[PDB]
Scaffold this active site. Sequence first.
Site, PDB file in Angstrom:
ATOM      1  N   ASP A  41       0.730  -1.033   0.104  1.00  0.00           N
ATOM      2  CA  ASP A  41       0.119   0.056  -0.196  1.00  0.00           C
ATOM      3  C   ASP A  41       0.834   1.340   0.107  1.00  0.00           C
ATOM      4  O   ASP A  41       1.699   1.345   0.757  1.00  0.00           O
ATOM      5  CB  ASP A  41      -0.847  -0.068   1.191  1.00  0.00           C
ATOM      6  N   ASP A  62     -10.328  -0.429   2.049  1.00  0.00           N
ATOM      7  CA  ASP A  62     -10.437   0.238   0.511  1.00  0.00           C
ATOM      8  C   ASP A  62     -11.667  -0.492  -0.018  1.00  0.00           C
ATOM      9  O   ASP A  62     -12.379   0.129  -0.956  1.00  0.00           O
ATOM     10  CB  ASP A  62      -9.149   0.024  -0.247  1.00  0.00           C
ATOM     11  N   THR A  88      -3.982   6.210  -3.616  1.00  0.00           N
ATOM     12  CA  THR A  88      -2.644   6.580  -3.149  1.00  0.00           C
ATOM     13  C   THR A  88      -1.328   6.523  -3.820  1.00  0.00           C
ATOM     14  O   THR A  88      -0.804   7.400  -4.402  1.00  0.00           O
ATOM     15  CB  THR A  88      -2.381   5.539  -2.098  1.00  0.00           C
ATOM     16  N   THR A  89      -1.181   5.238  -4.706  1.00  0.00           N
ATOM     17  CA  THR A  89      -0.215   5.358  -5.590  1.00  0.00           C
ATOM     18  C   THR A  89      -0.416   5.716  -6.989  1.00  0.00           C
ATOM     19  O   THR A  89       0.416   6.424  -7.777  1.00  0.00           O
ATOM     20  CB  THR A  89       0.226   3.754  -5.627  1.00  0.00           C
TER      21      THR A  89
END
Lengths: 479, 502, 488
Positions: free
Chosen positions: B44, B367, B77-78
Amino acid sequence: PQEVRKANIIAARSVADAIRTSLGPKGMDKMIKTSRGEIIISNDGHTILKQMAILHPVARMLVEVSAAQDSEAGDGTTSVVILTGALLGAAERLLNKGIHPTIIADSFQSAAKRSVDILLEMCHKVSLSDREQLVRAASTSLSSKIVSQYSSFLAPLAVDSVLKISDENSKNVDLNDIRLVKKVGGTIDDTEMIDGVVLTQTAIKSAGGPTRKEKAKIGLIQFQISPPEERAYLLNICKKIKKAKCNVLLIQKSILRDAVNDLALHFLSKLNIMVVKDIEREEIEFLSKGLGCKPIADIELFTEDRLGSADLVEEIDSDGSKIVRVTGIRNNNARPTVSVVIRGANNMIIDETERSLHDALCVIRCLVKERGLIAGGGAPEIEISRRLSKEARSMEGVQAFIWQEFASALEVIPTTLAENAGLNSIKVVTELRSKHENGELNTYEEHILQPVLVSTSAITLASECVKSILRIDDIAFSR
Amino acid sequence: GLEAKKSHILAARSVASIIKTSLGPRGLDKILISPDGEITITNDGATILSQMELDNEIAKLLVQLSKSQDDEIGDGTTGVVVLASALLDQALELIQKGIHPIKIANGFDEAAKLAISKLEETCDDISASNDELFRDFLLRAAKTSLGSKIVSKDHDRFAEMAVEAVINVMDKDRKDVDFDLIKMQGRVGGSISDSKLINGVILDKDFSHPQMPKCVLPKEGSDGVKLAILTCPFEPPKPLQTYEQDKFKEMIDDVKKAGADVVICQWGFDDEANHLLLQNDLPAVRWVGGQELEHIAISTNGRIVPRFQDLSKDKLGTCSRIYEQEFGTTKDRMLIIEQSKETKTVTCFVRGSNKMIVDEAERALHDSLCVVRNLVKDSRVVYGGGAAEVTMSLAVSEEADKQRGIDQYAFRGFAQALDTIPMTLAENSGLDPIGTLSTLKSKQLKEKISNIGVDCLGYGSNDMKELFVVDPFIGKKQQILLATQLCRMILKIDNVIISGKD
Amino acid sequence: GKGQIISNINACVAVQEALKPTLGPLGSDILIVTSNQKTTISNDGATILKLLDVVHPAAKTLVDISRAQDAEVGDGTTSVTILAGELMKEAKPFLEEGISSHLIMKGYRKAVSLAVEKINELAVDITSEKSSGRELLERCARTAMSSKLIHNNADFFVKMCVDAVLSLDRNDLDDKLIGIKKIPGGAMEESLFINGVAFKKTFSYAGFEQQPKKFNNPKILSLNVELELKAEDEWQLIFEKLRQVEETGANIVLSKLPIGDLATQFFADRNIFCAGRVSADDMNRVIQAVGGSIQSTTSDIKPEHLGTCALFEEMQIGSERYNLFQGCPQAKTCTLLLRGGAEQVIAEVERSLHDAIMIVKRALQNKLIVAGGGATEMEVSKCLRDYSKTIAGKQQMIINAFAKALEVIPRQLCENAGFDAIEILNKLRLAHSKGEKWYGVVFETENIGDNFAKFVWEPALVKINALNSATEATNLILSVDETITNKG
């Protein structure tokens, strides 16, 4: 092995970016100070790269590319260097993605061949039978030269000179067969075609020289009239020439000994044999082509079959000139050539005038190989990128990304033209692509035209240049 | 104004280049070391970016945005950081060409709005296709995130837990799922197959004295189970054994009159306090946190009673029953508080045989609960996994030639920046990023317009529409908005000022 | 000596170059990281300079004048530092030629006296134009509200928005105190402005039309809640409470809860009006309207709580009779009522009217307004060059550089907005000197335009206070030939 190629690309990109500022008449001039103390100033890319004495081995190839650029097309020596560096700059990000230069090199050759057919479809089709566009092409090209009003009469002289040697399928024609002899005195308004031949020097100024002869034979002779009793030795020399009835003697210029003795001048005066000495070594090969003769080293090698024919050989009277002309070579085997005499009062006139006629003959010769012309000013560079935008989506694999970067490198040439003119770089380029939906090649009303061979050869030479640059993976010392 | 524009691009690129290899299910993990000496390994990006402590002024904007992404979406996020770095790399080439930085900022804003309208035409409906196909998306929503872990064997059990939990805490009116209404609690030991779904707060308790019963009796058909919430400790009045015992008989009458079965307080209890509560069948609960009291009143529909005199029967929390159920082989022997009615809050109960498995399962469930919220809030969805970015690229690049001016190059650079994600997914999948990108563009033009993405994990074939791989449209729409919002703030700051360390 | 001044010039430029992109609403922002590790981002230059805390005296002087600009005014904090710093750059080459720093300081002082005189001339003050407190502000909201569906009726709508702030004290303006309620039904252009507080009819019970709507000498009474026959925490006890209203002679009763039918029957013969279910925000505005006070019970009512307006009437607007207060010049707040065929249509027009009120709000506080957008900035620089012919001598070149230093304000505004500062300055001076001098620079699309036509205005006291602060701070830095910093 990438450290060798990346070092050569960065070194060559700095050279291309340095010449990039010299594009256009308003471009930045580069200064080079030789070790001997000589300093030259000019925007010519072929002169800068020649006098730079580049130690980098791969960067020296740009001199050979610029040499073939002026020899084939005759224009774009600065633009071909910019286009070469544009592909090298775009190849830096290609190596970062893990692409081997073989695909990079093979894609440039395939993209250069397809770019030619795109320009031909958008080019205006013209023919050599119409002299309207042939005169206006050379007249507008001389607006960058000292000649202005006299350039109107110089255009048709260059058109009729090429149309005789162009024929139809002859395609490329050697430019070395066209000799421009500059001499002090006279003016530009006085011009003579003299399709037979023209020499570079005057005739004998001593006493007894006829300086004019009618119905004479011309041949190349490497012999020299010199003493070893002396009049008897020179009599057999003049007698053997009389056997073949050669009334015109051409002696190769040499600082070793003299040309013709004064005692032999009285012997040749009775025979009415005209002598022209101080023949340069460069004209030895020239006279052996148009006249169809052969260089003769000794007196025994001299024969009648190697002698040509000349209607009238005379020395034209002019101020500080005295130019000798020959007409009616009457040779079926040797094809005729064009030799134009350049006259003027100042030495700086006949100098730049000769160079100005070089660019005028090249552009006309560009129409001989491939007919048609493309309006300059960044039009052909942008038009190709417009066609490659939708074509890049039709490809597949690694090559699909190359078509997008190839069109991006073509935008460097029109961008530099806007920078050197003081206008905003991006703003001018966007205005050209905005009107591209309506107009296509439209510069036509400004009487600014460019031949198609310059834009074609610039892409072909730059595609092979960059192709050969990526082929060197190592640099070794071999003596 | 000189070295700032060049340094900001290289600083944000080196930081974003860390998580580029971790994008996708095939993305490689990393070894993180806490300052206390604990080693953690997870894929993550939120865990990796939050643990970064650095003085670089440009990289701090990635941490400030990542905190808001977990609550709103959690999957951005990424993906957003890699997408934000793509806009910066394309902006670096424009700065060298003389393009104004605010024009680059405003150029990406107008280009992002045009790409949203293009996906609005090509998106598909879920509930219009079928009702049960919607639940099939929820069952396979957590399977994608858990497919790369050992949890993928039992994944079928965790799929049903997220379906019933969101329906209770979220109403179809506002369609909002509050993170504070979902209590995430887990412990080490046991297995992952014993995880159960609880409709209310857990509130583990040992029931004080062992003689107290482990179950709550209905008390002659009484309604629900009444519990007392006390924010004040239980002590005798002060500015001996019989004195304090007589004072305790007055305060317990408030429980008997109100009829509270169990007493809950924030502070500990005395020994004699449990003696009177034992004979009255009143289990005592002590050592309760302040935040735990909020989850009690929301699930049981109770109120906060500030003092002893304000205790009433209407403010008592009502539940179905309270019993102690043994969980696995753990000797803690926790308890379960049920409801049987729809509440406004739930508590997630997750167990695992390893401390890392518990932490990885709680974050993966976080998530998964957010995807369900986006599917209900927006029925229109698109197919991700590389198919959405290629569709947005061909849409902006096609409209780039139609829009003249300076924005023509702003649309081309924005379309090339969108190609970073599918190429990154292609690089993270072990395939040619350029060769794969040309394949996805060829299938969506010469054949027909559809969604075909890049496969990070080995599958049968392409065209994820056949495999029913769905991503929320509003979830992907929130990612591209935060990417353009972050890219502007980086360009809107040309100055760097920092003091020394004394 | 003179070398210390050069060191002080670079100190002001280093602070200026950081604040150059921060000029303008679309300009760049500075990110400062304090030693405390707390990172903040602020657009305004005050907070930016407060976190730096520069030890250098000349750079700290620009911080002190920036805090006073944000305190007494609040606008022009960034522009006062850029103008003072750029003025230092023009005086830098003057020291190299041998010009003393004294005449440089006195040279700029002479230019300020000529500049301030031209500011009052470039300002817009209308007297003989036969206008009032509305038509001046009504036009400014027109163009801002132009190009909307209400454009056809836009002439009638600008009257109610400007008169909203005019009904109360012009020194203290608050937009939150002005309430707006939607009335379903009726034409949009037929809406009327109300000086007092207005609300709807909350009575659901029969027995209406039993009270007169016209009072000759009404009295305002405030009682929180009684108004009930049965307590919602006896008939004679309520009658005694209602008698206190009769003893004081009050025809107006307002409460926050509903009113029983007992009070409506007793108030009929006494011509007393009562309205229940009034919002809490309405009750506070009615008290401030008449300047009275509210009493808890009916026994403690004091005589000074009563008040009277010019006239009371209940209009039929919206096919329903609504309460409104008209003819109250002492009302501290007004209330607006909009009409329309649908409630959703009014909501879209209501939100559009809030933007027009905020524009005319800042214009009413400061009655001295000059044309912005480079108009005034270019005229001041042009006039100093023409009047410099009598300033001829060493004082001419000093003021001529001051006129060039005034061009840094529009520069950074065009550079931060994306426009080219090179081309915009050449085309603006040509259009400014030839024809009308009101041609400014458009902030949206680069082109020549009239800011007076777009009705975009800027207060003059921001530029006047910044011009004197930039010159006063400049004379302090140019006068320092030596700087000694003691340790401690």
